[PDB]
């Protein structure tokens, strides 16, 4: 749902006389910016711990950068999405180089295949698959195959849209 | 009970709006009993 | 526009589109701005903006 970053958002309830040291709650939020990250954080604690924005505060917001953005990884995402029937579990796999890229591809995938918007999707877990045997889906199992190689048949050549006419008929072999 | 200002100003002191319907009922009963007694007296004369 | 957001915009001196004002953050001002959120954009300006 856009250029996202993963944010560590830590918040708490405001201290009182009865409770001088309230507990701290940390979440990992995929959001375009810090305002959306804090808003989603307060939404989830309103849904979980009955802590409101007016009676609480944000302790910390930090950006979680990918440890190895130049390494190709397989990601398993467990999600719940809301449709006219109700809430459904889904497990899906994405071959990406970062968690934020996996989550962006997930959002585009659910939009394409189930018409699910951002508000109806809850991301419950995003994990990196440690082993090749942990891959469940055939469309990632074919990509992690040994000695993978394929050609690219029927490639349309890149022709400028401002060049209206061509003197030769293009080829689709390279 | 909402009360109109004109009727409240014209209302005598001590009386409330909560007895107006009882007052009207008592007046109607008094008129009906007066007519009944007149009919009874005429029937007794007959 | 409903009369209460109209009155709040009149008190915030936002009578024309693309008019801007500086507001000191108190509860009494923050609640007004939260009411007229469907018509305004607001935020925290830095020294360069000021």
């Amino acid at each position: 749902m856009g250029r996202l970053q993963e944010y560590q958002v830590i918040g708490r309830h405001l201290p009182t006389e009865a409770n001088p040291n309230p507990a701290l709650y940390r979440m990992r939020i995929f959001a375009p910016n810090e305002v959306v990250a804090k808003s989603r954080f307060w939404y989830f604690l309103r849904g979980l711990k009955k802590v409101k924005k007016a009676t609480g505060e944000i302790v910390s917001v930090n950006v979680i950068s990918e440890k190895h953005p130049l390494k190709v990884k397989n990601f398993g995402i467990w999600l719940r999405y809301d449709s006219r029937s109700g809430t459904h579990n889904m497990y899906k796999e994405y071959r990406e180089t970062s968690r934020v890229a996996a989550v962006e591809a997930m959002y585009a995938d659910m939009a394409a295949r189930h018409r699910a918007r951002f508000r109806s999707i809850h991301i419950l877990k995003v994990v990196e698959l440690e082993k090749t045997e942990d891959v469940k889906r055939p469309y990632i199992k074919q990509l992690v195959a040994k000695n993978l190689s394929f050609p690219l048949p029927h490639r349309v050549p890149k022709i400028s849209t401002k060049k209206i006419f061509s003197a030769k008929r293009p080829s689709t072999f390279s | 009970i909402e009360v109109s200002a004109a009727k409240e100003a014209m209302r005598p002191e001590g009386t409330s709006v909560r007895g107006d319907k009882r007052r009207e009922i008592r007046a109607r009963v008094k008129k009906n009993q007066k007519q009944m007694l007149r009919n009874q007296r005429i029937a007794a004369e007959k | 526009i409903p009369p209460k957001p109209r009155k709040i915009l009149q008190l915030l001196r936002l009578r024309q589109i693309n008019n801007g004002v500086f507001v000191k953050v108190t509860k009494a001002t923050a609640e007004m701005i939260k009411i007229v959120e469907p018509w305004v954009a607001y935020g925290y300006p830095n020294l360069k903006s000021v």
């Binding site: 507990a23 701290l24 302790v59 | 409240e8 | -």
Partner: protein
Amino acid sequence: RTYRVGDIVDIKVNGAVQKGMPHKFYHGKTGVVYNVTKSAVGVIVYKRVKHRYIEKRINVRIEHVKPSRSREDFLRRVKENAELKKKAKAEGVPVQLKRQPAMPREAHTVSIADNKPVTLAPVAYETTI
């Protein structure tokens, strides 16, 4: 409680009698007493129609009427404002006598040594199992 003409009272239709009574606008309204009866009281209420105020008069039974505390804060603040100004003149120091709106919170530091944060998922896993 014996109400008198001129005081400010609150109207609260108590009990289950408000299930089918027809005139529910004045429930929760506050007005000034103009007439007193043994089981009834006369209350002046103001309605707003567009740009003006109009006056209505209602007759409310005593069991649905409580005395209001509208001027309690004002009379109190008058009392300690006078007392604080008197002691300000006594010990010769200024005192801040105006009530102020809540200011934004200042900067502070929160330690996590004995209060390590708890990581939360959008649903609880205890509920999932």
